[PDB]
Amino acid sequence: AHAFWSTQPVPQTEDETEKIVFAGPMDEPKTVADIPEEPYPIASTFEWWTPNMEAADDIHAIYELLRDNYVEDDDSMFRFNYSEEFLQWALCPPNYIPDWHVAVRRKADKKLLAFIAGVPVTLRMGTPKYMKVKAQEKGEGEEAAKYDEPRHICEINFLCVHKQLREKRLAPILIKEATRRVNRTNVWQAVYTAGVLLPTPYASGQYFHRSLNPEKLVEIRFSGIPAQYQKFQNPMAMLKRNYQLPSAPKNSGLREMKPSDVPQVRRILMNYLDSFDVGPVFSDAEISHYLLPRDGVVFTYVVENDKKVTDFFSFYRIPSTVIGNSNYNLLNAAYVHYYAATSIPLHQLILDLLIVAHSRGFDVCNMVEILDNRSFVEQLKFGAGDGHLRYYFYNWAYPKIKPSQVALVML
Ligand SMILES: CCCCCCCCCCCCCC(=O)SCCNC(=O)CCNC(=O)[C@H](O)C(C)(C)COP(=O)(O)OP(=O)(O)OC[C@H]1O[C@@H](n2cnc3c(N)ncnc32)[C@H](O)[C@@H]1OP(=O)(O)O
Ligand SMILES: Cc1cc(CN2C(=O)COc3cc(CCCCC4CCN(C)CC4)ccc32)no1
Numbered sequence: 001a002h003a004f005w006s007t008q009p010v011p012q013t014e015d016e017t018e019k020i021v022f023a024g025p026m027d028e029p030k031t032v033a034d035i036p037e038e039p040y041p042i043a044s045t046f047e048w049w050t051p052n053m054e055a056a057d058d059i060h061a062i063y064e065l066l067r068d069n070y071v072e073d074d075d076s077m078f079r080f081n082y083s084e085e086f087l088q089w090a091l092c093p094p095n096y097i098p099d100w101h102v103a104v105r106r107k108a109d110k111k112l113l114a115f116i117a118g119v120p121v122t123l124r125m126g127t128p129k130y131m132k133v134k135a136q137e138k139g140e141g142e143e144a145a146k147y148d149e150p151r152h153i154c155e156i157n158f159l160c161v162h163k164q165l166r167e168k169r170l171a172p173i174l175i176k177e178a179t180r181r182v183n184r185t186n187v188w189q190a191v192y193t194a195g196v197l198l199p200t201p202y203a204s205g206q207y208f209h210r211s212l213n214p215e216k217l218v219e220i221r222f223s224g225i226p227a228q229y230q231k232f233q234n235p236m237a238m239l240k241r242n243y244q245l246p247s248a249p250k251n252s253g254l255r256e257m258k259p260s261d262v263p264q265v266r267r268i269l270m271n272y273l274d275s276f277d278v279g280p281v282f283s284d285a286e287i288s289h290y291l292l293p294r295d296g297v298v299f300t301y302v303v304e305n306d307k308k309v310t311d312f313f314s315f316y317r318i319p320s321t322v323i324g325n326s327n328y329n330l331l332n333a334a335y336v337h338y339y340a341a342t343s344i345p346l347h348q349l350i351l352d353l354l355i356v357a358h359s360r361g362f363d364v365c366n367m368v369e370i371l372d373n374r375s376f377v378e379q380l381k382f383g384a385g386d387g388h389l390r391y392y393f394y395n396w397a398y399p400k401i402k403p404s405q406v407a408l409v410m411l
Pocket of ligand 1: 159160193395
């Protein structure tokens, strides 16, 4: 059962979501006035704390908690080690609400014990295309389009309870207090992703990995020698040959994005994301925030020829602590972010992505099969991983969609 999730306004089973035909709210319509003004109760030995995610030392504290206690792969070989600069970037986009950053500490000694973060996002989340066609067949076009306008909602990420405090029903409390603070801002939906199955995803995608430094990955046990590489005299030399990349990008006029590219990159990205059922809508301020280059955090390259931006790609860095190997401290992973191609095939664009990432010392390039990411898997030699990313809404009925109809990248 789900003692917590059964009480929440989300579809409860796969069967329920097979049935949903229109996008819309699950819950009782409510007002800010209905929502408690005071934080949710918690044990006297704890307190709620709102870190200042633009203060270096508050960023450091959250950084430590995540470094030591956040997501691990299924065999606890790797643990995400999001950097402090990455955390300030992800948690402080334009018009972020400091209150949506919710921490728990031990009252006595201010020991940091748990965290959960909300940030705003304007998301297109109306009835997906395939369901609108059915709606129109049935004369229900109006019901189907009702919630088509981009909504100002909450994106939740970074939920983390300290390893000492697991299975004490703390996470429900964080979710409740997060829900309260968001409702008090008059926001009633949230979108979240997780690598675990909860009630109930609207989309689910596999993870894909493209080795950049195969000898290191094999050492740290990220990959391993496919027993078909045992056919060969020298498995390692063949593996390096298979994954070798150009040492310089191949598209003429590739360069890093600059501030004056903002409007053009906004246009081409928004034209592209508009073709997906679920996807974010970005102002210029959000385009500069989420895509302008930031050392060690986000890297974005544009194709410009005849000074017109016709193509761009972006990736962001999340290192992972290598928990089982002491020879290497870190796995240096690059994560495919947003992109758009109008002048060249997408595999040709993302090949440059791989070249840059390799060139900058990244060990592997990861992504989920959202967007048009499947369109370059084979030719660029990405392999499916163990993981799946599951997409969820809070308080929003949504029909099942393919991951290739999801245009929202989560950090
Ligand atoms: C309108 C505004 C709405 C805003 C809120 C929207 C909702 C956002 C929801 C959050 C989106 C987060 C997106 C990300 O950041 S996903 C990343 C999650 N973080 C990690 O995996 C880090 C490693 N793990 C931990 O720190 C803890 O294990 C966590 C905190 C994950 C669970 O803590 P713990 O292991 O000590 O368990 P408990 O005894 O306290 O609680 C047990 C209950 O918690 C349910 N549970 C377990 N894992 C998750 C999970 N990832 N999302 C939602 N619920 C989860 C579980 O099914 C059970 O409920 P029920 O089955 O009894 O019913
Ligand atoms: C093996 C392996 C490990 C990695 C990097 N990684 C970690 O270090 C920690 O465990 C992981 C687990 C997953 C799948 C689960 C991802 C769930 C979160 C959900 C929270 N946010 C929005 C980002 C992704 C992908 C990559 C890693 N990539 O391949």
